[PDB]
Design a protein around this ligand. Structure first.
Ligand SMILES: Nc1ncnc2c1ncn2[C@@H]1O[C@H](CO)[C@@H](O)[C@H]1O
Ligand SMILES: [Cl-]
Length: 345
């Protein structure tokens, strides 16, 4: 039985705009399979462009928010989870806020000065490729000032577990660094997601600094590969990355266990920790082609499923099964959609 506000997240609350994309779109915007890029000026027309498409699916997104609200949904006790992010003063932001309240997720949103609008993600779906283009928008305005308000910082102080995705490096590194230091100094549980290859490539300093306060690190194969390359881990890159991340000193230099989990799609996921000489494979339930509805957000669900069980005392293997279950539930649904809790099985 977990205390209220036991779990705290901060991140970028975003609206996902899911569209069946034509094949030209990927060439036109130079987009890649299973990837995400932050919108540059050359990308900006995509939002007006996909808005001309029918069958648009609008749904609340944001990597950290996805994970934290599913932890809340899984555990099913009201107000166990807390979330902080920055939205705009528009209908999109209000929809995202109402979605959180419907889930019994305690929030303290910062509202961006008008007319800065709530961030959005163009999620381009096709049989050939899936790809995301993110316009952070209001999420950038998330500040240390808002986080340090007595009524918001108190959510951080009461939490024993934190989840922050690497994506927040781009929006409020100062805040996530402050929370990370608070966690380590108080011997709490800080969970960190590598989130995307571009973070390890262009924000290497920030990723490695975050790892040094993280008790648990989540990643996927492409993130491990990009991380490995940037660190000169030429051979055996994915295994080497898992070992390297697990063994990085903590910021206070204190001897401590860090757990690293690298997912690999349909292939066995890898896990190890700093006390473990070996890297373990964990077999994953094989999916048929027709079973897969939408894998977008599966990694976010995986993290939620793992943490929700792990923080309630379930052993490593049991928690991994819970993580796969979470991801599988999301894979069989469109966008990060959480239905009635009774049907979770
Ligand atoms: N730059 C970003 N920051 C936070 N979340 C993001 C970012 N880009 C994509 N996402 C989210 O990642 C989710 C898929 O893991 C989508 O719901 C999408 O909204
Ligand atoms: Cl996020």
């Amino acid at each position: 039985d977990l205390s209220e506000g036991y779990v705290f997240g901060m991140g970028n609350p975003l609206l996902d705009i899911i569209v069946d994309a034509d094949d030209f779109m990927y060439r036109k915007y130079n987009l890649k399979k299973d990837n995400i890029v932050l919108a540059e000026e050359k990308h900006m027309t995509i939002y007006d462009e996909i808005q001309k498409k029918k069958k648009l699916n609008y749904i609340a997104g944001g990597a950290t928010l996805n994970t934290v609200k599913m932890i809340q949904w899984i555990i099913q006790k009201p107000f166990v989870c807390s979330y902080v992010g920055c939205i705009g003063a528009d209908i999109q932001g209000k929809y995202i806020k109402n979605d959180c309240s419907a889930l019994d997720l305690v929030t303290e949103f910062q509202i961006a000065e008008e007319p800065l609008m709530t961030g959005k993600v163009a999620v381009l779906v096709s049989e050939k490729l899936r790809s995301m283009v993110t316009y952070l928008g209001a999420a950038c305005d998330l500040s240390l000032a808002h986080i340090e308000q007595p009524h918001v910082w108190s959510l951080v102080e009461k939490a024993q577990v934190y989840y922050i995705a690497g994506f927040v490096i781009n929006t409020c590194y100062e805040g996530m660094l402050k929370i990370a230091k608070h966690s380590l100094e108080n011997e709490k549980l800080f969970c960190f997601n590598l989130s995307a290859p571009f973070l390890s490539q262009f924000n290497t300093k920030e990723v490695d600094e975050m790892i040094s306060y993280s008790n648990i690190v989540f990643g996927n194969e492409s993130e491990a590969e990009a991380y490995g390359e940037v660190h000169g881990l030429l051979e055996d890159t994915v295994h080497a990355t898992a070992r390297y991340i697990a063994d990085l000193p903590f910021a206070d230099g204190k001897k401590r266990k860090r757990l690293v989990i690298i997912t690999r799609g349909k292939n066995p996921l890898l896990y190890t920790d700093s006390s473990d000489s070996e890297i373990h494979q964990f077999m994953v339930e094989q999916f048929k082609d027709d079973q897969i509805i939408d894998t977008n957000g599966a990694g976010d669900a995986f993290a939620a499923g793992f943490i929700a069980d792990y923080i309630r005392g379930k052993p490593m293997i049991t928690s991994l099964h819970a993580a796969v279950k979470a991801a599988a539930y999301i894979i069989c649904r469109s966008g990060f959609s959480l239905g009635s809790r009774d049907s979770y099985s």
